Structure 1
């Protein structure tokens, strides 16, 4: 007679191809990429002949086979593809094979193939749009937004984006290499801990707790191997396989290492670590370079060199070559993007007409034109055009676009920036003709999270009532709110100025719109980004 029917033993059924060490703070120890997950199954036979061969089947296909030598057995084997499998144990002899009932096993991998799709309802004022304009609709999500801002990946209105950028991936380095982090309490030390044992100029993760270990919706079980932002982003990719999720390297406080990459030894090590990062974290679709900025005038006053423009072009070429090789190794398309200053003086430090041939998209940072760092020269921080009271205003969106076009950049490369926050001042005074921007300020506006910066959600929720004046400047295409009794002035984007930017993108055949940062919108800004670029209402 055929063997008795085996009973699969109770035991762990959750396995991982990329293993995460739960007691490690150094990135080198935190993550271990294997070629395959080590899987184990045991069984007991309570009634019958134990057969002469035991097999472990996954979806009917043998993963392991060995002699059946007693009433219990154990099998250890490797599984090299992520997903969920119906596992069975079969006992066979010359008279037949008898298979157990199936037990699901989970083999995790960083494409999220083990995860249920993270398909969450739109929140706040977000309305559904189909991505059918063919234009970029991008936004940055900040790793630290999960703390005080409580804005997690399940709150992203992901169906309303083509590109979701994750800010920010650091580059390892201590004194002289990441000194801009010392301005933020604990932040330099946190990077040194993550990079312990790791060579300078390789990428790492700044906050591994937020990125990988914090419990979040859909990844709360203790043995879910990928939690935090990365676990949710993997599940988001399962829900939106056409969403491009790009890691953004740099930003305001993690850009200092780029200034050393004139040394090709360091630049090669960096590019190689990006390749390894993309091989490790398979849900990411490329890389965004947010080097702020070639030539300096970023956070660090002691960095910046006339060599930087040449370094940037080389870096983009070499990243592109690395990504092209990864693309053909994988069959995937990978994107290379960069967030860049929108000031003409900054733009002309770089030959974007050459670099563009390596780049899928240029994220023109047409915001932060004005702010509380300068209390004397006030103006619209993200306007399309100059205002009527100062038509020679240098820092406008159109002036940045025109600087790129004048170099020879193809318009389709250029993605125009919108701000989901205001900047502003307090004590504005001494202004003419009811235009507060012609005065001067005594200090920054009180901010939502830090001085001088206000979430758009808070502008809309608190500063469009009471004593606050509201004005839309139709020459600049720029709203502002002003409280006369305290001299608080806030400059920001709203649905109408975003609509002007979208129409401008379509009229000039630019590439689309992007925003910073997604946590600060109540939905009005991203709704207008989508509507103004011609995306249809509804779901696809």
Structure 2
């Protein structure tokens, strides 16, 4: 029984072209659904205005660093349809409670953080009392919403490299002292959260999981894994976003294998191996698959061959499924295929698919059945814990999940 996990983005239902809800999740093919994202009462200056307003609203009457539902309309209020369970809310959470009823062996986790809401962790990590309050209140939150099976932490990232903590910019790069403080704080956080969950177990007699995302390369090495790992169930390795429309460097976003043609030698295999070397047990590690792609326009010096280690484009694509530069899998299948002038290609050495439009000079890197099969099989051979996807709505048919399930649970 390997992990076959999917993230469920709380916001995706709002796209009329793919209004994906909890009722669309292929629950019988997953071991875990992870609800993205919750946060805490702390600074969100780097998030959208929408998110900052939602947070400020929820902060009313709560202590600093209290675990919160952010989009409460999505989570609790919007009617996604009647359910058999008698719960005093609607939203996605009523649907998750129903899903748990119909699929009792599925594990459902809330994820705290994510790219745009990691910022408050940096403030929380400065004080033990802040971390205690977040731990206490996060466990109270799942105790109240008792279809949840534990807690996932998606703090991008202790030691920096996230949205408000870029090392490439002088005034956001974290100091050595702050990196060190955050290293110790992450251990304390997971120790405290694990203890709080163990107390909940003593009350309810259920087992709870505590898991975390892990960034790649230097972003993994900001945590003391030898100290932290005993507290954690799974580490979800974010083996994606290697390249993107933020830079002119063009190539694979989530390639399984590093090659001599990779930009900067990147590939999921090399990053997973580093994580194991840092002291994450392979059997706790879960490789990441993407149900989206990224793309570039005005790709230079390229005729449709294999991508190389110096491939560049004018810029990231000024087009996307919603925000520019990324594409959900379903949008790629519908709108960026052969009939639209995009040639599907597969880099066998990398195990990664890409799309090349020769007339328009557009390059897209993504993930498909072939690469997911390859990643699941590699995970098995590397004695990993399983595979997960960011995020389920990219695959409305459930066809990519089916590959994850069949190939991992094999």
Q: 1:296 to 1:425 in 2, by over 3 A?
A: same
Question: Counterpart of 2:211 in 1: which secondary structure?
Answer: strand
Matched, 1:492 2:366: yes
Deviation at 1:296, TM superposition (A): 1.3
Of structures 1 and 2, the one with the larger relative CO (CA 8 A, separation 6+) is: 2
Question: Counterpart of 2:313 in 1: which secondary structure?
Answer: coil
In the alignment, the residues of structure 1 paired with residue 278 and residue 39 of structure 2 have an alpha-carbon distance, to the nearest angstrom, of 30
In the alignment, the residues of structure 1 paired with residue 31 and residue 294 of structure 2 have an alpha-carbon distance, to the nearest angstrom, of 27
Deviation sequence 1:108-138 (CA, Å, 0-9, x none): xxxxxxxxxxxxxxxxxxxxxxxxxx10000
Q: 2:112 aligns with which of 249, 261, 264?
A: 249
Task: Give the corresponding residue for 1:5.
Answer: none
Q: Number of matched residues?
A: 393
Q: 2:25 aligns with which of 143, 147, 156?
A: 156
Question: Counterpart of 2:269 in 1: which secondary structure?
Answer: helix
Task: Write out aligned runs for 1:458-497 (5 A).
Answer: 458-466=331-339, 467-497=341-371
Contact 1:180 1:253 in 2 (8 A): yes
Deviation at 1:431, TM superposition (A): 3.4
Q: Which has the higher strand share?
A: 1
Deviation at 1:439, TM superposition (A): 3.1
Q: 1:275 to 1:389 in 2, by over 3 A?
A: closer
Task: Give the corresponding residue for 2:298.
Answer: 427
Question: Counterpart of 1:393 in 2: which secondary structure?
Answer: helix
Question: Counterpart of 2:184 in 1: which secondary structure?
Answer: helix
Deviation sequence 1:149-196 (CA, Å, 0-9, x none): 4111111111110000000001112xxx21112xx2422112101221
Contact 2:41 2:66 in 1 (8 A): yes
Task: Write out aligned runs for 1:70-469 (5 A).
Answer: 134-148=1-15, 149-173=18-42, 177-181=43-47, 184-219=48-83, 225-260=88-123, 261-301=125-165, 302=172, 304=174, 305-306=178-179, 307-342=181-216, 344-375=217-248, 377-390=249-262, 393-431=264-302, 434-435=305-306, 438-445=310-317, 446-466=319-339, 467-469=341-343
Task: Give the corresponding residue for 2:401.
Answer: 526
Deviation at 1:366, TM superposition (A): 0.4
Deviation at 1:461, TM superposition (A): 2.2
**Any gaps of 5 or more consecutive residues in structure 1?**
1-133, 536-540
Question: Counterpart of 1:178 in 2: which secondary structure?
Answer: coil
In the alignment, the residues of structure 2 paired with residue 506 and residue 484 of structure 1 have an alpha-carbon distance, to the nearest angstrom, of 37
In the alignment, the residues of structure 1 paired with residue 283 and residue 190 of structure 2 have an alpha-carbon distance, to the nearest angstrom, of 18
RMSD of equivalent CA atoms: 1.9
In the alignment, the residues of structure 2 paired with residue 303 and residue 242 of structure 1 have an alpha-carbon distance, to the nearest angstrom, of 43
Contact 1:250 1:289 in 2 (8 A): yes
Task: Give the corresponding residue for 1:511.
Answer: 385
Deviation at 1:419, TM superposition (A): 0.2
In the alignment, the residues of structure 1 paired with residue 107 and residue 303 of structure 2 have an alpha-carbon distance, to the nearest angstrom, of 47
- TM (norm. structure 2) is 0.92
**Any gaps of 5 or more consecutive residues in structure 2?**
166-171
Deviation sequence 1:441-467 (CA, Å, 0-9, x none): 222222111111101111122222132
Question: Highest CA radius of gyration, 1 or 2?
Answer: 1
In the alignment, the residues of structure 1 paired with residue 58 and residue 219 of structure 2 have an alpha-carbon distance, to the nearest angstrom, of 32
In the alignment, the residues of structure 2 paired with residue 167 and residue 229 of structure 1 have an alpha-carbon distance, to the nearest angstrom, of 11
